[PDB]
Subunit: 434 residues, 4 copies
């Protein structure tokens, strides 16, 4: 299928865009052009050079100067931006520490997530309007965090938009379950996709209430697995939890499973931000890490060095699967192979007992021009109470951001499970973070 | 996967049971036993002998004398019975003709559909209580008509039951569309499965609002197709609409398409009973047939002869795929595959603007011990008005049956599109049919 | 309370306007001005003249030539128009007779109701825009039929409108029940207001599921009353059902009660148009009348002579209570009393199992700048089925009118219980009336 | 109306019991008997003796020793109990202080409310079964706290029960508003009931979003009132906030009003427990009191002395109105005078965006054998978020207490706005309070 046009917003991205370049370079099902748009033209142009050195020539990349130009005639829109700068992020993630509040990531919920979301609203409002004006029939795939707020803003501003949010966190839990099947049953699992899960919740706080490998029910096995490794934790093969800030021993997941009876389906570093527990103040004991801003600064600098190397040497990205589903979803949407995978979309009943329209993560059936959520049922009662509460806050942030009502955003702030400090301290903190 | 147990209610069946046997005999994924139960033990016994002459010895068949014995330890329950005798049906289908009302099938809606549903209610209440008592955790596949009422009674009497209703009408529309692709585009379609349709409605009144073959949108093509063959009709390769009471030239489907803008997705003979039209009074002009009860008595008699033939020649069923999805669905339910196919289930949002709990037909994602409806959107407004109306009637019939409230059943009777006679004529007709 | 401003759209009226003038001229709680608007300026003028010969000069009347002028600074907007002329109405009501369709009133449902609705849509869309632009904060009282459609158009076009539909039909059944108390119990009833009823449904198809007079439950009593007079009918004291086309012996209401078990709460002449029955073709057996358009023409001519009589003698209307609740609702809306009375308003749960947003009739609590519906429960099942079906047609008419979609209008026409003819006869009929 | 029977559960009361006796003795609209039940039969007997010296002998009182005897043939059931004892309550209210958590009342939300709820659940389950068994048609009026949880349990255990919860808190805010009209307008207000408020929320956390005195809008006036007296607070005529643990200067309400823009409608001492604020830590700054359990024990001893005084003096209660609406509501339910007043009932739409079935407080229209909530619209967004959260907790408690699930009760405990401590601290506290 030729002459596909993909518009890429955040096209100077050194993460999602690269990962998309790799997968495009190996899918023989498709060809076309990628319009790269970034507030920072310099980064977009380096991606144009790197992309045009990747794979066949199957995909032609172009750094473009405006949104309108990127979207014109686009069939797919990909969005992967950073709402603000590393300096903003420093505040997002670390300022609350002066009040005793710790955050492992800060891009989804808690104080960081609330404030980052406010900052993201007008960015997404503006993108929704551009997509409405220039490519209203395109499918939009959002990678940006906080994911529930960004995606929801897309639908508040352009009600008829065809948009999904994509996240890779559930994939990590499927891998965990694939290795468990081997360790507990001695049987090999070809691909993590073969771990068939009924996953539901909201981004970074998803839960698996049924799971199987072929004819085998995985829940009772996860029961024993969790019981055996609850204290020690469990490390993936060839990994140690201290290898990087992204690694863990799944102690937080095991602990949540004991309490709620569903399998937590995101990394420990994400799960820990959604509810009360000793996790965030004793990460070493719980065998995961917080991600500090020094890490992000360092990582940015070595991605920059990598980028400059690739150019100097006139190389493209590895022609190697990233493990993402972005290109698979795009192929599915174009009618080149149907797919059932987890996505974030407005709730119309696919998760029971949660507000309708709220952005929820579930399996969906994806085929030509169609993303169709699958009814996935109910969360455990305790998790549902927590999810309703976070959705409350997320809806308020999206509204607060569109109408510029800081009073309402502060209500959300005060309603967040991590903001457990006196009201006047929180107000000073909130105002300082704005 | 071995030692699976299927309970078959209506196990003397000479339609669905045979098709199930053929499909079982060629699937190498599974093996176990089929308990055949039927009020008429003689027929079940004959299916037992034909069954045990079919395939590899993969499946062992046993005719059993009671429901309890069929159900105990059952993993799957299939239901394919006739609610009443063919003598009862002669009344369902032909008596209203004295008041000028013709029916082509009379097993779904109209006067015969209503009376028939009424009769089926206490049969399925009893089946539901037995499944609850002996096989609470089995999956139940219902094939019996009136589909929406029977299936609904299962859930009303056993709210926790795991039941779907299955029908093959949508397959016939998929085959029609595959042939249209070949005729309009000149390209082959290898399987009717490759016609990926978004289908929705209630049984025998299903509609396709989106459809594709690979990258191609089929809806614009069906519009051309319909304009070209609207008058003359269109006949499947190597067929003539006169060949049997089951055949047509799709004139009714083309006519409904022009009116409603979605593709009607059942045979003309079924569609014709759901709405006002010239159809039922001029079936030969509309190029389809009515099915008189004599045809069914005749068909049954030649099926009886065929059955005696196989018993004499000590042969089993044809080891040939039936075209049905029953066995594929069972395999998916056991975790031996995953499948997206159309089924009947309680509405929890998969069809918009239709009462919740009512039995609707949509695609559903099926995997180990999971049937999960796919959100399929809205019908055309005209179609949705009719469907809400029939659903009203179906709900009232189910209630009327469980509470023996003939007054309420008469209200449904009166609300049926085919009953356009004075109220006293209808009351007299209704009482005669009871 | 003084300097109230009321805008009257349709103020050339000779029904509601005159009746309003009476009620206004005797309420001591209020004073202000009435801006009379009417396509026919001359007739608005004559109400001006006659209004200004009424009351104390408590109310100053003024004919105004434009909506905008009328609406400016209005606290209350009253709408009482005739959608089209009496000649149009001759078509609505009598043309269908050629196909054997009879109508008693034809301003609400049936073929005449549908066509009249279509006609009234653009007229109400226009009024809705004016109110939005010139008097968004006013309370709006609609008296025009077809009530459910007109009022719904108001909300569809101006979502934030504060609008109710008012009808006097229920008062008639309250009067009936008041006479029944006297006849069955010997005790006097001071006012029909004291018959405290739980009323619900849609305009002209309202039902009373609970009723009382002080401590006495009227349902069991109506049951006896109904049993005793079902065959003979019951005529109001000092009345004979033949006195006028508005009179009846309640035989239809008794018949509907026996079937459904709630008290129908509109005149037989309206009820008879909503469901199948022998009523319309045997009006004398059922002791009610059809209203031919010749009667409306005669009636209008005398009202016109009366008009000119008053103008010639410098006389106004009579200072006498009309029996309506209009002025009393206005007073309650201004804070000068509070009130619980029946109104038509969008459904938000006040009637169970009926679509939301559909215009339904229930009791509401009315107070300063507030009309708040009272949860009234469910209709009997057969009645709910009928009402859902009418609501369906009504929504379809509203949409059809707003988008100019005759195709949709015809679907509603086809779905109307009074339209029991062949489709092609109905098509010809529909086009002839359009 | 004579021979009415009222069952009083908790008929040993020295609070709601006495207030009822007073009000009964002055209402000449009614006559009958009161069956007094109380786990402490001697306390019920004393109310019998005191009761049978009260009124004209309008009401005869009888202490009965079983629920059966109390309930059988009852028209009205009143429930006014203390769930557990004053020692249990000492734990509810004061134990959490060891963790830095203060509570002003502890009978509604927070840790004490959650624990008291668990205690009340089985008591109300037992009462609901008895009412189902012996007086299914009675109207049930609940006064017991925790009110939301207590009333809900009645409906969970006996779904067809006819029950409301009654509380007097909103009356206090109507007085405030009455005195405000006089102070700000100089004009007098005859009755707190003339302050006509649109009130909604959950018990002890109700809000008034519209309010008036006749033609005057009270909200703009409360805005000025609140803005003037926000710092000083405002004391009622002839009152000083220090006068008793029940008084305040409305500083908390004024503060909530500035933040949310709706008039909070419960005393400061209840409001304080529902959200984060500095209120409970600086009560003296905010001009309200906490209620120590030592005060409750002293109050109980003085009530025991008054009881003995009345007996010895063979005096009944005073023939003086209590200010409650209890007897008024009873009269209305018997058909003796319709009434619009605030009650707690399952949510079916009367409050927007709040789960259905949940016990919510709004106006209802009460008449013969009918309590019909009035649609009251939405809370301010920030208040709705808090109420949904508290409702989540109340539903968890109702279930946990029935099904015994301390796991679920603990999630509710952790989701309560007053429990802002480490999870292991919370678990130790929670376990201790069990
Ligand atoms: Mg993520
Ligand atoms: Mg079928
Ligand atoms: Mg009317
Ligand atoms: Mg209270």
């Amino acid at each position: 299928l030729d002459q596909i046009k993909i518009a890429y917003i955040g096209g100077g991205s050194q993460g999602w865009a690269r990962s998309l370049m790799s997968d495009l370079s190996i899918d023989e099902r498709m060809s076309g052009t990628v319009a790269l748009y970034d507030l920072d033209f310099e980064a977009a142009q380096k991606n144009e050079v790197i992309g045009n050195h990747s794979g066949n020539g199957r995909w032609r990349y172009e750094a473009v100067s405006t949104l309108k130009k990127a979207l014109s005639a686009a069939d797919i829109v990909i969005i992967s931006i950073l709402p603000g700068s590393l300096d903003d992020m420093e505040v997002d993630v670390h300022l609350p520490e002066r009040c005793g509040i710790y955050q492992s990531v800060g891009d989804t919920v808690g104080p960081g997530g609330i404030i980052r979301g406010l900052r993201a609203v007008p960015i997404f409002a503006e993108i929704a309007r551009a997509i409405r004006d220039y490519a209203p029939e395109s499918w939009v795939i959002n990678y940006t965090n906080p994911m529930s707020v960004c995606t929801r803003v897309l639908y508040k501003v352009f009600p008829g938009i065809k948009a999904i949010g994509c996240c890779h966190e559930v994939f990590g839990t499927q891998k965990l379950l694939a290795e468990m099947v081997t360790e507990r049953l001695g049987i090999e699992v070809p691909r993590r996709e073969d771990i068939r899960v009924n996953v539901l919740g909201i981004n970074h706080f998803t839960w698996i209430t049924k799971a199987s490998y072929r004819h085998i029910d995985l829940l009772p096995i996860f029961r024993e697995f969790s019981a055996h490794y609850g204290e020690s934790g469990y490390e993936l093969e060839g990994e140690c939890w201290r290898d990087s800030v992204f690694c863990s021993a799944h102690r937080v997941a095991f602990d949540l499973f004991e309490t709620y009876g569903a399998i937590p389906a995101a990394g420990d570093r994400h799960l820990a931000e959604f509810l009360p527990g000793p996790y965030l103040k004793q990460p070493e004991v719980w065998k995961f890490h917080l991600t500090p801003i020094s890490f992000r600064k360092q990582d940015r600098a070595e991605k920059r060095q990598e980028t400059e190397r690739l150019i100097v040497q006139q190389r493209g990205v590895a022609e190697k699967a990233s493990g993402e589903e972005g290109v698979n979803i795009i192929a599915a949407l174009l009618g080149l192979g149907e797919l059932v995978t987890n996505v974030n979309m407005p709730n119309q009943g696919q998760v029971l007992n949660l507000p309708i329209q709220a952005i929820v993560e579930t399996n969906a059936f994806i085929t030509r021009n169609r993303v169709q959520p699958i009814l996935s049922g109910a969360l455990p009662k305790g998790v549902e109470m927590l999810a309703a509460r976070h959705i409350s806050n997320q809806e308020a942030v999206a509204d607060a951001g569109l109408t510029k009502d800081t009073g309402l955003a502060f209500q959300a702030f005060l309603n967040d499970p991590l903001v457990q400090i006196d009201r006047s301290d929180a107000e000073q903190l909130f105002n300082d973070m704005l």
